[PDB]
Design a protein around this ligand. Structure first.
Ligand SMILES: CC(C)=CCC/C(C)=C/CNCCN[C@H]1[C@@H]2C[C@H]3C[C@@H](C2)C[C@@H]1C3
Length: 280
């Protein structure tokens, strides 16, 4: 195990600790591509957590060091192991650094969190925080990147974020956050705090299912265009997607509770993989 291998293994650990789903799916990639993914993930994770600001500027500065001096040795201010891995990746693939900066800008913003007036700002947030992740991963998951590849990855990520939001309504409220748009909360006649006190009702379902139908529709457009990705990645991406979709059912299964996080059992993930793995 070379030093660089240790670095990637740190990145691996960060990823299976914090997101079982993507980990389960992406680890199935060929050695070289999964390592790149581990590394992009860990950099993203670390951006997400820089909250609990000084450390976020340090991450941004490290990323810029790499962008403009890929082959020079840096003394990273943030996480050496993560940045060493990221720099190794960038030496071999065309990383969209602007997407990292988009992601970071979006995270700065969260500490001024103001509810979204309209779905459009909700969608722009889904871009900044997840669509950007899709863009960064594109060169890993396809041989010849075209605007179409980026577009599909962008849409997949935004759709996954949306599911994430659909799943964490409860937890998110507690942390003083709501991602449903004022526009759409007025329209559907819905007060989060109220439902978080008195359980669900027909108006909440409707609002929730309204957003769910959106995620689900982006999902299919993505599956329809799965072909933009490399052959080895298509089944993995689809598996990753199908798992996050299945979380939609889980939430209905638990009658949309806002007091517990639902999840897809590892065993069910393998079932989906088989379903998918069968015809590939
Ligand atoms: C794998 C592909 C194509 C996309 C994955 C994209 C997915 C689902 C990202 C999860 N996105 C969380 C980003 N972090 C956000 C940031 C604002 C706020 C506070 C922090 C910082 C934690 C959360 C909520």
């Amino acid at each position: 195990m070379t030093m660089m291998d240790m670095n990637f293994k740190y990145c691996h650990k960060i990823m299976k600790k914090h997101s079982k789903s993507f980990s389960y799916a992406f680890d199935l990639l060929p050695e070289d591509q999964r390592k790149a993914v581990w590394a992009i993930y860990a950099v993203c994770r670390k951006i997400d957590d820089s909250i609990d600001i000084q450390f976020l500027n340090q991450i941004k500065e490290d990323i810029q060091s790499i962008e403009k001096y890929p082959y020079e040795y840096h003394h990273f201010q943030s996480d050496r192991r993560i940045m060493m891995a990221l720099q190794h990746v960038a030496q071999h693939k065309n990383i969209a650094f602007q997407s990292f900066y988009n992601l970071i800008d979006t995270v700065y913003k969260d500490q001024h969190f103001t509810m979204f007036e309209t779905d459009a700002e909700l969608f722009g947030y889904c871009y900044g925080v997840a669509g950007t992740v899709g863009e960064v991963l594109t060169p890993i998951l396809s041989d010849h990147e075209t605007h179409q590849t980026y577009d599909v990855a962008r849409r997949l990520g935004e759709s996954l974020q949306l599911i994430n939001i659909l799943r964490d309504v409860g937890e998110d409220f507690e942390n003083e956050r709501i991602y449903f748009s004022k526009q759409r909360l007025k329209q559907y006649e819905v007060d989060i705090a109220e439902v978080y006190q008195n359980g669900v009702n027909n108006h909440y379902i409707d609002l929730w299912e309204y957003y769910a139908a959106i995620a689900e529709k982006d999902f299919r457009d993505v599956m329809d265009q799965i072909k933009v990705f490399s052959i080895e990645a298509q089944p993995i991406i689809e598996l990753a997607a199908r798992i996050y979709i299945e979380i939609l059912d889980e939430v209905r299964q638990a009658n949309y509770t806002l007091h517990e996080r639902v999840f897809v059992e590892k065993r069910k993930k393998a079932k989906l993989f088989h379903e998918i793995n069968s015809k590939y």
